[PDB]
Design a protein around this ligand. Structure first.
Ligand SMILES: [K+]
Ligand SMILES: [K+]
Length: 2038
């Protein structure tokens, strides 16, 4: 744990002192607050520090003594909050108690100060929450009075209010709390605030939610006041349109008014006299109770609806006489009828009582009584929702009367709203639309847009009315003349800051612009400017931007660009006084730059440079109002216009970094929030610039990267600006196809990223973001793995592992980095190190050590491969042991201050580490299956039971997660699941939830663990029948129904969701529904339909439950209740694609085809159609929507609308083009419905199309028509995009002539600016490519518009949808050989050839899979089709540049769909056989394997998704084999990928199918791929994939095809026949052929027959050991490898050698027998295999050293032993071989025995020598230590062989072997015999002998020097005159030829004899030795072996010898060494380099 800031003790000291000195106190507390602020990385540690130093006892003294100072309060609550945080985390009881005793009263004082400060409140509210979570809640009643007093302060924020009201409610929930509020000013204090200040924002509603809950609880305790009900009613009225607040208002009201008063009220109205006090008071009371929805059903039950309708019926006759008394009655009664009309049952009753005719007739009497008219409109809205009642309401002339009333300006905005809502509700029915415009009053709505221009809030019904009517309008004239556009423009301006409301207005203006003559009425500039401003305000809203751009492309003009550009200069200068002026111009330059036909005008004026200079002026000056807004607007402006352009972005990117580094920026940001300020916005801006990849060039990238580092360097504590910079670095690294990675390294940015991560260990988003940069840089270039290691990246990610242990996102990020930096080869030894240390700690009683090493152990285990090491070395058995000990020794708790954690904190930590270890282990099949086999599912359960958690500690929550995330993994295996139930763990888990309240992670993991036991239907039923699981299910439902907290609702609902997604069982769904979930979830969508998050989560669960359960049955089979809820929420969430998808999904599951009439009655049709229109590019919306429309008029409406189009274009009305447009538009919605009878539905599809072709040819340029006709054709093409036989689709489009029409339209460039036509049009093009019957005419048509398709792409490069549609068309088009040719020859232009453009596009939409996948698939198809048609390859593909660019688009977290498309691209490139050079150069295959490797580390995809990746990889390797790149696959572990696929997917037929075809193609490509398939892959197929080949027809048939390829080559049948499991596999195939037993089964049978016959004919087994040798020898001769690792065909040859030899070794062998000489050849064969270091571990596995030693010892024939000696002698050349050889018991004595036998034998001296050399050679290599051969008589045998030589008959070669072995065995133990045999004297004698054999002297000199290793021999050498004999020899030989090895070896002898020896160094000096050394250097210094040894002598003479240092300084040695240095001139030969070194 970290240390606190030292200055905290000086701050605490300052406030302890100066408690009284107020200004000094404020300094100290202000200082202590900043130490306790989260900006400090040590805020928790500092706060704990201030606690321990005793500051609260001073702070409490201060808040009391100075209760009036708010500044104290802000600082005090900050310190206290930070404590509570660190308190909750530490879970030290000592502290939690203290902070609650000494600390709680501090905050109680802050609360009783009526704080108004958002931070003071927020810190205080968060204090009590954390204290409660810590087990020390602050009494809510002690805080209730002060919190309530917060509301007498008028200017309180809504965000602060909501937090406080939520607390009051919880406080009031008790008797003590309600009482405190009651006596501290009652409900009026709160409710008065809600009324006088409350608003209708999301937070104002959430606030009033809590206020109503507060009143409700006080009502339960009789703490309400006579003012409460009235104020509650008036708040109900205020929040009428928001059901979340209304529902909690009626709940509160229900608690003030019992059910007893309802019945008395109604019975009083039935009996009491008319006009009496009791009647009047009863009717008033009934008004109040009409606000209670739980009473509204009681009113209807007791005939109250007729009573209210009678009041109106009987009142209208009386209106003439008393108009005002009657209007009031009507108002009151009609409002009650409006509130009664909630349920569909309630609306039924109103309708049964003649409500419609009553209300409508009353409207006809109240045309001059506005209040009553509004109440009547309010009662008709819910009735007009039904189509049939709205028809009745038209019949009665209501709309025809309310419209002229609005047309004359209803003054009250309240009445006007209710009246627009009614006309809007009615307009949502298609048949009432035609009435409300086509009959009359189309423009009456338009003129009303102009009246309450700014009122629109819930009153957006003026927009919606024209939004449902403009599609029908055939002209904008009326809407313009009446001022409709002016009113909507004027509306958007006012409401421009409300996002939702302005998206609606921009959509309405977009629809206006589609009208045919709309350019003539909206081209004055006022419409443009209102849209541009809106687009700049809401760039985050894709729907607003997209609608705005459609509109501008139609109406915006050049003059719009000129009139804003002309004022740019002036507007920038006058921005201080007139900031709006420059804002408007910026909005126009930004938005109009998105219009393709207008972009260039702003760059031809270099407006970007001007705006950038203007930003600097606005910063380098005095701060003025609007300065922030203006700078942020200009930053967004310059970003948008550069992105929309196509120039390089370096200059602008640098200018934005420079702007951020201006000295005044710090000042400007002081006054803002840290999240939103100009610095954060500037970094976000130049990040988006970098994301485009339009920064090219080493110079430029360096500039841009330096600039980013400057920003990071200059603002160290702007943590949102730090993030944006890290992201920017990620992008810049990818620029130039990854070459930005090199720039990022050599500028130091890689290390800067590491440095920042080390600085900010607490910031999780920064860890992920920073490691992403590093992972991106590694994946692109693994050469930066070295740099990251030297930057200490490993320690940094080690720290983030431990800090954010529960972050799954932080780990999929760092996973590749650990593998790269982890010691790749030191693991197997280091894991077994900690494995044994942990076990040892358990053997003792050392509980600390277990933790310490389990902690370190986990760090190692993270390595994916390292996790497989631990599993392989028996960690599971280890783990079961650790648990046995941990759970037993809990009294070890008392560690007694001997470790970092003590007490119970230490027990849970060990449990946590033990559990975490098994968690990493269970990553892949290797680990998870090892733990299961060990019984670890039992050890985990035992571990979790050891977490009894009597008192929560700060490692226990994490201990549970690890424990439960484990069993999620392990229990998913069927056998282990039943053990769980056996242990009664379901109950132990459920109690585990209630043990740890407030922990959403435990709840989630406990539920995922519960479902993991219910893998099958039997266990699902076991689970849901458990009582504890029943009580859990109900307490989750309870939380969804009563907990106000939105977050707890989302958590509960998520828990339920997973239970149904995992188990996926009709019994889970059934039990969840019956627990109350269906009604409770629909209630969420009914009350919280305005909240996207709650509505989406609720819908998600209901759709899951609705797939098994008939949802309507929970509403008594009346589907209208839930359907209305779904439709209501659907309309509120219209513009949230995600919410629309899930609402339509519950609707489509709730309803059936037998609901056609119920669904039409509710207008569901138009609501669904409206959605499909807005989200027209959402695949999900169009699917669900169509499926719903199949329930509401399948086939019928389609047939009728088509015929109607023919009737129209035949007559020839003046307005046909306009008329059919609205027909086509209606049709496209239906053409999305699945058609069960395509024949009938699409009868007239070819003529209908032919009639549209005519309509288009006579009415060109009708933009809207052109668009809707494209949409229908896409819907026709989409429904049979794959069935090339269907005639009612893409075929029809071509037959009828449309296909040629569309092509002409695009060829004429008339449409290029119309994106609503180009998208669908190019989708239908794509369809006519897919259908092979349409292709010939597509080819016949395309050349006329392919160049336009290019220019089209450059235009719309910024539109992802248009780009994706065009690139997709090119993908399919490129399949035809003529097409792909036309593409390359016609699509070339300003952006390069078609390939360059495609890259540019993907780079711009790098975040968009649809564009990227379409682009890669396109390049793939194009490259391949071109090669097969004879065309020439694509230069930039053959260049390797596109591969680098495409690799850059592949980030470490790119989706699976993008990985597949990238693999398909590479596959197609390989199949074309045209790009091998580039594919090898850029290492495509290696990178693909790496990526696939990473996805098994991360383990983020689903097993089905990885199935596709491996299946896809199998196909890539298949193409590689065909391409001739098997050499490439072996550089990396290519083949191993197929083996991995077999092991993990052996049960997946679709993987093994591709694996078989891959192995077949690899084999027939290469002989060594054939071998590895036989020896490695087929054994896996016949065992790990045997059931798949057996059960799946395609695996069986492809396996037979592969076997037939393998057996077709001699020798393979023999080896396959011996493959384990092949017979079981072949037989089951036959079994399979019997089942199908048709032409396929007969064919499969013949294949097995051929396979068996081939293996029988190829069962020779014809080979001996001499064969394996003659073969190996031929290779070694020819120069080939004999490494089995690298030459797979030698695998069999070695298996045979081990077997034949192993069997020869059973007997004694005569070398002159067939098997003896063959035993010789086998050992000569091994000897060649031993010459290679790779074979050492193969031979080591087969006991090579052990065999040979047995032969040498056992075999009595010396000629058999000879060749065993040699074979072992070569194996021992390599140290690790000699290590094992010489280490096995007896080897030294045995090898020496072999030596002895030959000295005592009586052989010819000829062979006696051969045997001695070889066996003494073995002695040399085996003598790894000098003390190894001590106990054996090796010295005796060496001396006897020497003595035999002195008698003669041996050559000098033997003596050299005697000497070589002697220096290895010479030791203190043989010293006595060395002196007896006078070895020294003999060697001295040979040295002195002037006739000595020159071939023997070098070894003599060498042995003599080596013998000096023994301290006693060293001295004897001097006493025996060895040094003088050596100096004499050196003098002798120096001038002679052929003496270089003597001079060399005599100098080394000198050095070894004197190095640290005072006696011999003085002998050597007196002989003139030092001068001689220098003479060997002056002479013969140019000889490198000589010069090297001479220099080695100098060093040894100098070592620890000052006098030699002085002597050789004046001896002339320095000048001699200088000459040795100068002899060099360039040689890098190994010899000249060792010389130069010495
Ligand atoms: K009361
Ligand atoms: K308006």
């Amino acid at each position: 744990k970290r240390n606190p800031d030292a200055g905290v003790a000086t701050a605490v000291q300052s406030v302890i002192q100066h408690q009284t000195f107020k200004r000094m106190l404020l300094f100290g507390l202000r200082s202590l607050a900043d130490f306790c602020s989260p900006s400090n990385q040590l805020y928790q540690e500092n706060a704990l520090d201030a606690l321990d130093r005793g500051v609260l006892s001073a702070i409490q003294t201060a808040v009391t003594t100075f209760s009036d100072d708010d500044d104290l309060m802000l600082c005090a609550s900050r310190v206290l909050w930070a404590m509570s945080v660190a308190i909750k985390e530490e879970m030290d009881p000592a502290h939690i108690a203290r902070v609650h005793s000494e600390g709680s009263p501090v905050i109680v004082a802050v609360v009783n100060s009526s704080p108004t400060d958002p931070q003071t409140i927020e810190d205080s509210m968060n204090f009590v929450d954390n204290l409660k979570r810590a087990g020390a809640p602050v009494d809510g009643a002690s805080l209730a009075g002060g919190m309530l007093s917060i509301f007498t302060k008028t200017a309180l924020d809504m965000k602060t209010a909501k937090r406080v009201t939520a607390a009051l409610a919880i406080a009031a929930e008790t008797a003590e709390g309600s009482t405190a509020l009651y006596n501290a000013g009652g409900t009026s204090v709160l409710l008065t605030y809600c009324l006088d200040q409350g608003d209708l924002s999301d937070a104002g509603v959430e606030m009033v939610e809590g206020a109503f809950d507060t009143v409700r609880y006080m009502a339960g305790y009789q703490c309400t006041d006579a003012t409460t009900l009235p104020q509650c009613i008036a708040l109900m009225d205020k929040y009428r349109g928001r059901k979340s607040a209304s529902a909690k208002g009626s709940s509160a009201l229900a608690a003030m008014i019992g059910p007893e008063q309802l019945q008395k009220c109604l019975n009083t109205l039935k009996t009491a006299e008319a006009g009496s006090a009791e009647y009047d008071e009863a009717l008033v009371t009934l008004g109040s109770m009409s606000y209670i929805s739980s009473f509204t059903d009681e009113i209807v039950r007791a005939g109250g609806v007729p009573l209210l309708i009678e009041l109106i019926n009987s009142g209208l006759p009386q209106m003439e006489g008393n108009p005002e008394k009657i209007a009031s009655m009507i108002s009151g009664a009609a409002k009650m009828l409006a509130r009664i009309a909630s349920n569909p049952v309630n609306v039924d009753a109103i309708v049964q009582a003649g409500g419609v005719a009553t209300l409508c007739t009353a409207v006809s009497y109240c045309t001059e009584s506005m209040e009553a008219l509004g109440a009547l409109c309010m009662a008709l809205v819910p009735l007009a929702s039904r189509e049939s009642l709205a028809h009745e309401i038209v019949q009665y002339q209501t709309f025809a009367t309310v419209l002229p009333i609005l047309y004359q300006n209803v003054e009250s905005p309240e009445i006007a709203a209710l009246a627009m809502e009614l006309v809007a509700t009615g307009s949502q029915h298609e048949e009432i639309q035609e009435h409300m415009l086509q009959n009359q009053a189309a423009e009456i709505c338009s003129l009303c847009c102009q009246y309450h221009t700014a009122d629109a809030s819930y009153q957006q019904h003026a927009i919606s009315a024209l939004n449902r009517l403009v599609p029908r309008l055939t002209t904008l004239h009326g809407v313009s003349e009446y001022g409709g556009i002016q009113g909507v423009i004027a509306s958007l301006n006012a409401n421009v800051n409300n996002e939702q409301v302005a998206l609606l207005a921009v959509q309405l203006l977009d629809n206006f612009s589609e009208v045919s003559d709309a350019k003539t009425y909206m081209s004055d500039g006022t419409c443009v400017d209102a849209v541009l401003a809106a687009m700049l305000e809401h760039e985050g809203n894709d729907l607003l931007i997209s609608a705005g751009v459609h509109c501008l492309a139609r109406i915006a003009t050049e003059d719009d660009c000129a009139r804003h550009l002309n004022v740019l200069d002036t507007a920038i200068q006058t921005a201080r006084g007139n900031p709006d002026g420059v804002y408007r111009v910026l909005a126009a330059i930004s938005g109009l730059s998105r219009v393709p036909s207008l972009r260039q005008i702003f760059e031809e004026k270099n407006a970007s440079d001007t705006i950038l200079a203007g930003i600097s002026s606005w910063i380098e000056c005095s701060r003025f109002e609007g300065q922030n807004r203006i700078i942020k607007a200009a930053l967004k402006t310059v970003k948008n216009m550069k992105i929309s352009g196509d120039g390089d972005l370096t200059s602008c990117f640098a200018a934005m970094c420079d702007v951020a580094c201006l000295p005044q920026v710090k000042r400007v940001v002081e006054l803002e929030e840290p999240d939103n300020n100009i610095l954060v916005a500037d970094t976000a801006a130049f990040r988006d610039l970098a994301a485009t990849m339009r920064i090219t060039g080493a110079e430029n990238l360096e500039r841009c990267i330096e600039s980013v580092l400057r920003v990071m360097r200059k603002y160290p504590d702007s943590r949102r600006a730090q993030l944006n910079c890290l992201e920017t670095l990620n992008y810049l690294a990818q620029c130039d196809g990854g070459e930005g990675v090199a720039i990022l390294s050599r500028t130091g940015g890689l290390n800067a990223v590491v440095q920042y991560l080390t600085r900010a260990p607490m910031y999780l988003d920064a860890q992920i973001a920073g490691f992403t940069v590093l992972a991106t840089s590694a994946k692109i270039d693994s050469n930066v793995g070295e740099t990251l290691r030297k930057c200490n990246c490993l320690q940094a990610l080690k720290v983030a592992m431990r800090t954010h242990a529960k972050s799954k996102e932080l780990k999929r990020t760092i996973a590749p980095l650990v593998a790269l930096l982890m010691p790749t080869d030191a693991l197997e030894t280091e894991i077994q190190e900690l494995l044994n240390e942990c076990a040892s700690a358990c053997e003792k009683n050392n509980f600390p050590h277990l933790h310490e090493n389990l902690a370190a152990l986990n760090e190692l285990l993270i390595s994916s491969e390292g996790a497989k090491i631990a599993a392989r070395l028996g960690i599971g058995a280890h783990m079961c042991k650790y648990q046995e000990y941990i759970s037993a020794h809990e009294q070890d708790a008392l560690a007694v201050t001997d470790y970092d954690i003590l007490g119970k904190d230490l027990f849970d930590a060990t449990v946590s580490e033990c559990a975490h270890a098994m968690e990493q282990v269970a990553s892949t099949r290797s680990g998870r299956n090892a733990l299961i086999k060990a019984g670890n599912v039992a050890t985990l359960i035992s571990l979790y039971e050891s977490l009894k958690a009597p008192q929560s500690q700060y490692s226990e929550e994490a201990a549970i997660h690890c424990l439960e995330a484990l069993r999620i993994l392990l229990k998913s295996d069927k056998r282990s699941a039943e053990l769980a139930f056996e242990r009664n763990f379901v109950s132990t888990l459920c109690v585990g939830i209630d043990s740890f309240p407030h922990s959403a992670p435990v709840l989630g993991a406990t539920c995922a663990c519960l479902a993991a036991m219910a893998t099958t239907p039997e266990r699902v039923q076991m689970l849901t029948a458990q009582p504890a699981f029943e009580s859990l299910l109900q307490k989750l439902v309870f939380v969804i129904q009563n907990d106000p907290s939105k977050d707890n609702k989302l958590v509960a609902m998520r828990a339920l969701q997973e239970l149904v997604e995992i188990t996926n069982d009709a019994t889970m769904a059934n039990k969840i529904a019956e627990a109350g979930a269906v009604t409770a979830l629909f209630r969420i969508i009914d009350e919280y339909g305005d909240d996207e998050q709650l509505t989406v989560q609720a819908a998600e669960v209901l759709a899951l439950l609705g797939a098994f359960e008939d949802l309507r049955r929970f509403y008594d089979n009346d589907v209208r209740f839930p359907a209305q809820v779904l439709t209501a929420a659907l309309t509120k969430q219209k513009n949230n694609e995600t919410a629309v998808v899930h609402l339509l999904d519950v609707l489509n599951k709730l309803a059936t085809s037998e609901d056609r009439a119920v669904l039409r009655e509710l207008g569901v049709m138009e609501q669904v159609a409206d959605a499909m229109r807005v989200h027209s590019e959402s695949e999900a919306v169009t699917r669900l929507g169509g499926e719903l429309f199949a329930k509401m008029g399948a086939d019928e409406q389609i047939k009728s609308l088509m015929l109607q189009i023919i009737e129209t274009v035949e007559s020839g009305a003046e307005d046909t083009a306009q008329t059919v447009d609205i027909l086509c538009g209606r049709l496209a919605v239906f053409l999305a419905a699945p058609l069960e009878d395509p024949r009938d539905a699409l009868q007239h599809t070819e003529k209908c199309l032919g009639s549209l072709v005519a309509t288009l040819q006579t009415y060109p340029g009708s933009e809207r028509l052109e668009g809707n006709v494209a949409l229908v054709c896409r819907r026709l093409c989409d429904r049979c995009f794959d069935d090339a036989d269907d005639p009612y689709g893409a075929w029809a489009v071509a037959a009828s002539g449309m296909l040629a029409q569309f092509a002409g339209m695009v060829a004429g460039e008339t449409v290029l600016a119309n994106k609503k036509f180009l998208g669908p049009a190019y989708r239908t093009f794509t369809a006519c490519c897919a259908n092979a019957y349409c292709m010939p005419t597509m080819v016949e048509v395309a050349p006329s518009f392919l160049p336009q398709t290019y220019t089209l792409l450059e235009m719309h490069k910024n539109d992802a949808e248009t780009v994706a549609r065009v690139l997709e068309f090119l993908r399919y088009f490129a399949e035809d050989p003529t097409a792909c040719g036309l593409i390359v020859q016609n699509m070339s232009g300003s952006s390069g050839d078609v390939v360059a453009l495609t890259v540019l596009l993907m780079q711009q939409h790098q975040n968009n899979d649809a564009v990227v996948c379409a682009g890669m698939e396109f390049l793939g198809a194009l490259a391949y089709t071109l090669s097969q048609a004879g065309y020439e390859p694509l230069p930039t593909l053959a260049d390797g540049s596109v591969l680098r660019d495409c690799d850059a688009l592949m980030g470490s977290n790119s989706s699976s769909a993008r990985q597949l498309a990238h693999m398909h691209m590479i596959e197609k490139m390989l199949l074309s056989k045209a790009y091998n050079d580039a594919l090898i150069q850029e290492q495509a295959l290696k990178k693909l394997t790496m990526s696939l490797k990473a996805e098994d580390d991360k383990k983020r995809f689903s097993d089905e998704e990885r199935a596709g990746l491996y299946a896809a990889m199998a196909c890539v390797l298949l193409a590689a084999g065909g391409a001739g790149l098997t050499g490439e696959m072996e550089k990396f572990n290519g083949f191993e990928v197929v083996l991995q696929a077999i092991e993990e997917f052996g049960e997946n037929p679709t993987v093994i199918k591709e694996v078989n075809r891959a192995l077949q193609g690899l084999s027939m490509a290469d002989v060594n791929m054939t071998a590895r398939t036989v020896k490695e892959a087929v054994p896996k197929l016949c065992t790990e994939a045997t059931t798949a080949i057996q059960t799946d027809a395609e695996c069986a048939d492809t396996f037979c095809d592969l076997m037939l390829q393998l057996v077709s080559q001699e020798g393979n049948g023999r080896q396959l026949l011996q493959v384990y499991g092949l017979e079981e596999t072949l037989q089951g195939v036959e079994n399979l052929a019997a089942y199908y037993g048709e032409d396929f089964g007969t064919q499969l049978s013949e294949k097995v027959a051929m396979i068996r016959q081939a293996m029988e004919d190829d069962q020779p087994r014809e080979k001996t050991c001499k064969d394996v040798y003659d073969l190996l020898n031929s290779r070694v001769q020819q120069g080939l490898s004999v490494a089995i690792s690298e030459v797979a065909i030698l695998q069999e040859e070695v298996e045979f050698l081990v077997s034949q030899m192993g069997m020869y070794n059973q007997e004694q062998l005569d070398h002159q027998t067939a098997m003896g000489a063959d035993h010789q050849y086998g050992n000569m064969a091994f000897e060649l295999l031993a010459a290679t270091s790779a074979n050492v571990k193969l031979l080591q596995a087969n006991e090579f050293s052990k065999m040979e030693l047995a032969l040498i010892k056992g075999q009595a024939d010396p000629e058999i032993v000879l060749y065993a000696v040699k074979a072992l002698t070569a194996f021992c050349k390599f140290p690790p071989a000699a290590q094992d050889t010489a280490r096995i018991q007896g080897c030294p004595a045995l090898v020496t025995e072999a030596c002895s036998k030959i000295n005592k034998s009586g052989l010819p001296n000829e062979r006696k020598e051969e045997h001695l050399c070889a066996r003494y050679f073995l002695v040399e290599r085996t003598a790894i230590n000098r003390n190894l051969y001590n106990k054996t008589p090796i010295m005796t045998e060496l001396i006897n062989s020497w003595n035999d030589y002195d008698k003669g008959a041996y050559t000098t070669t033997l003596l050299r072997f005697v000497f070589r072995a002697m220096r290895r065995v010479v030791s203190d133990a043989h010293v006595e015999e060395l002196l007896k045999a006078n070895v020294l004297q003999r060697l001295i004698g040979i040295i002195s002998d002037v006739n000595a054999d020159m071939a023997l002297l070098p070894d003599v000199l060498f042995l003599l020097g080596s013998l000096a290793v023994v301290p006693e021999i060293k001295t004897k050498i001097g006493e025996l005159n060895g040094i003088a004999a050596c100096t004499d020899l050196l003098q002798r030989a120096l001038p002679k030829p052929n003496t270089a090895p003597v001079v060399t070896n005599v100098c080394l002898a000198f050095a070894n004899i004197c190095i640290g020896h005072k006696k011999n160094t003085e002998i050597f000096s007196k002989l003139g030795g030092p001068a001689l050394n220098v003479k060997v250097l002056n002479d013969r210094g140019h000889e490198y072996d000589v010069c090297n040894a001479a220099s080695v002598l100098l060093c040894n003479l100098l070592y620890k010898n000052e006098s030699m240092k002085k002597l050789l300084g004046t001896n002339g040695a320095p000048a001699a060494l200088v000459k040795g240095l100068s002899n060099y001139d360039g040689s890098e030969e190994k010899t000249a380099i060792r010389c130069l070194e010495s």
